[PDB]
Amino acid sequence: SGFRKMAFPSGKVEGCMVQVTCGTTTLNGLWLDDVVYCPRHVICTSEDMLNPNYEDLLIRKSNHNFLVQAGNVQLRVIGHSMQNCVLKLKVDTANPKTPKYKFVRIQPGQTFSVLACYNGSPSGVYQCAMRPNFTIKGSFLNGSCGSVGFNIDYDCVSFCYMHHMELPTGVHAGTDLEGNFYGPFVDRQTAQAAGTDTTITVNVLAWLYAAVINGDRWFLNRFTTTLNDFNLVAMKYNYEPLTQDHVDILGPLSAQTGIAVLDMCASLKELLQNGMNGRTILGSALLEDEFTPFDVVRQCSGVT
Amino acid sequence: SGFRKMAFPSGKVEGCMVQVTCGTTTLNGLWLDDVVYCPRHVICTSEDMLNPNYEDLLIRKSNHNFLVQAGNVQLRVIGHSMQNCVLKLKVDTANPKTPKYKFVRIQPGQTFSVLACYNGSPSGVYQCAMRPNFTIKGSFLNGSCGSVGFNIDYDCVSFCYMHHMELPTGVHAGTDLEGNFYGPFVDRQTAQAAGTDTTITVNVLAWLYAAVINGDRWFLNRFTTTLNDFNLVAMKYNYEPLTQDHVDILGPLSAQTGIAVLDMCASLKELLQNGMNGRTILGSALLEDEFTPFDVVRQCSGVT
Numbered sequence: 001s002g003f004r005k006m007a008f009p010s011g012k013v014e015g016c017m018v019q020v021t022c023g024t025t026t027l028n029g030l031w032l033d034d035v036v037y038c039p040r041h042v043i044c045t046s047e048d049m050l051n052p053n054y055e056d057l058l059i060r061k062s063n064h065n066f067l068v069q070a071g072n073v074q075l076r077v078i079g080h081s082m083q084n085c086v087l088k089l090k091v092d093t094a095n096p097k098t099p100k101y102k103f104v105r106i107q108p109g110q111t112f113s114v115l116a117c118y119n120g121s122p123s124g125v126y127q128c129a130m131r132p133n134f135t136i137k138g139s140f141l142n143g144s145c146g147s148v149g150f151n152i153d154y155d156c157v158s159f160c161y162m163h164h165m166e167l168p169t170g171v172h173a174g175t176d177l178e179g180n181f182y183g184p185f186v187d188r189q190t191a192q193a194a195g196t197d198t199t200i201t202v203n204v205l206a207w208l209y210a211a212v213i214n215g216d217r218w219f220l221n222r223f224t225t226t227l228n229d230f231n232l233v234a235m236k237y238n239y240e241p242l243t244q245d246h247v248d249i250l251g252p253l254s255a256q257t258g259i260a261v262l263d264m265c266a267s268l269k270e271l272l273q274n275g276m277n278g279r280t281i282l283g284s285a286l287l288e289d290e291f292t293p294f295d296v297v298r299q300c301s302g303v304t
Numbered sequence: 305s306g307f308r309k310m311a312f313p314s315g316k317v318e319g320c321m322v323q324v325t326c327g328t329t330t331l332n333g334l335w336l337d338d339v340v341y342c343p344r345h346v347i348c349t350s351e352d353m354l355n356p357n358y359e360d361l362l363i364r365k366s367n368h369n370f371l372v373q374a375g376n377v378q379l380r381v382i383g384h385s386m387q388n389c390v391l392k393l394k395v396d397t398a399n400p401k402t403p404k405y406k407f408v409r410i411q412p413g414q415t416f417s418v419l420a421c422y423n424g425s426p427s428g429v430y431q432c433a434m435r436p437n438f439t440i441k442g443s444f445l446n447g448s449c450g451s452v453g454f455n456i457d458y459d460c461v462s463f464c465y466m467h468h469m470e471l472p473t474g475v476h477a478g479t480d481l482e483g484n485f486y487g488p489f490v491d492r493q494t495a496q497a498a499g500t501d502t503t504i505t506v507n508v509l510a511w512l513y514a515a516v517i518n519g520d521r522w523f524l525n526r527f528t529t530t531l532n533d534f535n536l537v538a539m540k541y542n543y544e545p546l547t548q549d550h551v552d553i554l555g556p557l558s559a560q561t562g563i564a565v566l567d568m569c570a571s572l573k574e575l576l577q578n579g580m581n582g583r584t585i586l587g588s589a590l591l592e593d594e595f596t597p598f599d600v601v602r603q604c605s606g607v608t
């Protein structure tokens with residue numbers, strides 16, 4: 001028992017982290033096979049970032065201008081190309097530590113592990129969620145760009161995120177491994193304000209199920225609700241609407257605990273309307289929305 | 305910016321995880337050099353655990369009865385010995401992935417990363433703290449015993465914990481890598497109740513400094529306090545007494561933010577006396593005590 005914000009083991013991703021330097025800017029790159037992926041803003045100065053024309057800036061760069069270093073050995077760059085907001089640097093050596101991998105584009109509400117890196121050296125791993133406004137609340141400093149988000153399915157790493165920028169509000173924006181930003185963000189130092197950060201309702205419900213499984217049941221009430229009634233209260237509290245798909249996704253948790261999904265919704269509804277009254281759920285004084293239903297089943301069954 | 309509960313990269317420790325089976329019980333082992341470390345309760349049945357005599361149970365075991373498996377290859381056990389509550393199984397092959405390592409015995413309040421394992425396969429990594437009552441609040445299921453806690457200093461892994469048991473209250477107990485339990489716990493299925501779980505005051509203060517650095521300053525007040533006055537309030541709230549050593553340890557954070565330690569204590573004192581009033585600090589509705597001052601400096605400077 002016990003429930004923790006758990007990240008995937010990072011070893012498979014550590015073996016892929018390299019340092020990419022272009023001129024005076026050094027950031028992280030992802031080395032899979034003979035390609036190094038990194039944010040295209042590696043070719044910009046702090047000034048260029050105000051209004052960069054990446055195709056024009058790129059014309060002044062040659063293969064030898066991108067310095068790729070894995071550990072302490074230099075990789076030879078034999079080609080370079082821009083795919084949306086990421087650069088793909090073709091090296092002459094395939095990464096001997098390349099795990100089985102996929103590039104995936106996740107949905108808001110989905111969670112992933114982040115391996116925070118600096119100078120191609122991993123320094124920490126934490127679990128994150130793609131927010132409904134397509135931002136992430138990470139812990140990234142200058143030098144962390146190119147740090148990646150991933151999920152592991154037994155031995156295959158699905159890379160879903162690459163860190164690109166910090167918005168004025170302290171939140172983070174990045175792309176999938178094809179260079180496309182999550183949300184409406186652009187890699188330019190301009191007024192980009194994130195939208196409403198709504199709570200991922202289905203994730204909260206899954207975490208309420210994890211609490212029940214782990215012994216915290218004080219919030220279980222004698223009430224029930226409908227999807228429409230619950231959603232009225234959810235909208236008022238800036239919670240994402242719950243769909244029949246979410247109810248279905250919660251099915252295995254509903255089955256394990258014997259608590260119907262709609263009954264758990266009524267419990268959540270009272271927690272919203274009345275607060276925690278100074279109490280904690282799984283050691284938390286707020287409703288946690290960074291565990292998917294899949295994460296709760298995984299942690300509660302020990303999926304390796 | 306941004307502040308997350310960050311664990312060390314687990315790759316160096318993944319390369320050390322093996323499966324140890326003795327009879328019908330399978331748990332995790334730590335393979336460093338030619339020795340496999342694991343909880344001595346691998347030799348017990350569910351029944352033996354009521355009142356085990358480990359020296360007597362051990363007399364019935366031979367080298368060939370301990371099955372050690374790394375990945376999918378079997379390791380040959382050429383010797384076995386008991387050191388306190390851990391078994392050291394001498395294998396004929398040194399682990400080629402043995403990192404530079406140390407066995408350390410941490411103090412309560414110290415934090416560490418846990419690589420939760422099942423059948424010698426790592427399944428998740430999270431950050432933990434050794435509680436002042438020598439328990440840990442982990443996320444461990446059956447099969448997780450032998451999962452280890454560690455800290456990394458650049459390339460040297462300091463192993464500080466090995467998971468052994470879950471108490472009736474859902475909390476966890478384990479040993480350092482020399483077999484000695486943290487706290488008064490014993491590896492026996494008996495009434496073992498943990499003591500008062502007090503809040504690690506110096507860790508809370510460090511996290512208040514991290515909040516200031518990351519923009520959350522609403523809790524900064526116009527007051528100051530003394531160590532004796534603050535400690536009067538701290539005792540009342542089941543907070544550990546703050547010593548001059550803790551004030552000194554906070555010095556670099558006090559210096560970075562320009563907020564004296566005693567002023568931060570007065571801010572904490574009002575948070576204790578008045579609550580959060582429905583507000584959050586670093587996205588948390590309670591006072592977080594699982595970041596040391598060293599963890600805050602590390603995360604805020606990007607120590608790789």
Ligand SMILES: Cc1ccc(NC(=O)Nc2cccnc2)s1
Nearest residue numbers: 049140141142165166188189305
């Ligand atoms: C619009 C932008 C262009 C380049 C940008 N660079 C960053 O945001 N870097 C950074 C710093 C601190 C934390 N995380 C990331 S922002």
Ligand SMILES: Cc1ccc(NC(=O)Nc2cccnc2)s1
Nearest residue numbers: 001353444445446469470492493
């Ligand atoms: C006194 C004891 C002897 C053997 C014990 N085995 C465990 O506690 N195992 C376990 C199960 C779930 C979670 N973590 C650990 S307890």
